[PDB]
């Protein structure tokens, strides 16, 4: 298999045997160094695998693979390895990742993605994810002295546990909107994404939020800019565990006041 | 695929520079200091007298 079409068919044959079809040999399950660029998975595969409580893609290895401009939405992966792969510009609308490894991955998917990706019992170690995701169920581990993946454009990086998050270059209208306004964008924001974590990782959330605010202090901000996201900021920050954060509190204070004048 | 690499969200009123990378319009306007502007991806570029100028890339969709 030297091209995506071959890899598609190879999976498409291998996935089908996992109908199932039980059980599959390890060697045939490995898709190391695969290539799935520009592939739309539904067209090749059944709606069972791609909807509701249907079929599961279990026990695979997609290490060092390349999902780029591919569409992977609504699928469910379990016991899978995506280590070192690039999922940049993928379309993973409401894609589920269970008991999986997605460490050292590029997950800054394309905006086209409608529904937040969901990760459960999954690791995003040193994985740069887009700030709009569902991390309820994610496993976190101690951050190494690693470095953010080299990317073009955007701003500086903050750590969410051991996950990488990239701030915008400048806090502009759309920057503020997409990052903070989850009300206009129906539940999607970096606020919701940080808070999405399980209550277990309370401290990680706060440092992430604190770091997020630290970047918001730096930008020369204006009421006018924050006006459309006052409600959004408050809905998440005005509650624990972000009320026990002096940094967040003293910054949220004035913003919280104007909001209440309505 | 593409989004303003200042705001990192889908483009609004896209304006393409003469090197040529596309971004939101205000994203150019706010980024401009001392008039001049630079592509974040590579390097410097000319400023136009008012902003809200320079080719509006193909709009979709
Ligand atoms: Zn922009
Ligand atoms: Zn450029």
Author numbering:
A (entry chain A): 167 to 428
B (entry chain B): 18 to 78
Publication text:
The Salmonella T3SS effector protein SopA is a HECT-like E3 ligase that promotes Salmonella infection-induced inflammation. Lacking noticeable primary sequence homology to eukaryotic HECT enzymes, the crystal structure of SopA showed the characteristic bi-lobal architecture of HECT ligases. Here, using quantitative proteomics, structural and biochemical analysis we elucidate how Salmonella HECT-like ligase SopA specifically targets and inhibits human TRIM56 and TRIM65.
To circumvent this problem, we fused the minimal binding regions of TRIM56 (1–94) and SopA (163–425) using a flexible linker. The structure of SopA in complex with TRIM56 overlays well with the SopA apo structure with a mean root mean squared deviation (r.m.s.d.) of 0.9 Å over all the C-α atoms. The interface of SopA and TRIM56 contains a mix of hydrophobic/hydrophilic interactions with a buried surface area of 750 Å2. In TRIM56, residues Leu25 and Glu26 contribute majorly towards interaction with SopA. Although Glu26 makes polar contacts with Arg296, His297 and Lys298 of SopA, Leu25 inserts into a hydrophobic pocket of SopA involving Phe345 and Pro334. Although, the first Zn2+-binding loop of all the aligned RING domains fits into the cavity between the β-helix domain and the N-lobe of SopA without sterical clashes, the central α-helix of various RING domains appears to be clashing with SopA and rendering the binding unfavourable. Hence, positioning of the central α-helix of RING domains relative to the first Zn2+-binding loop is one of the crucial factors defining the specificity of SopA.
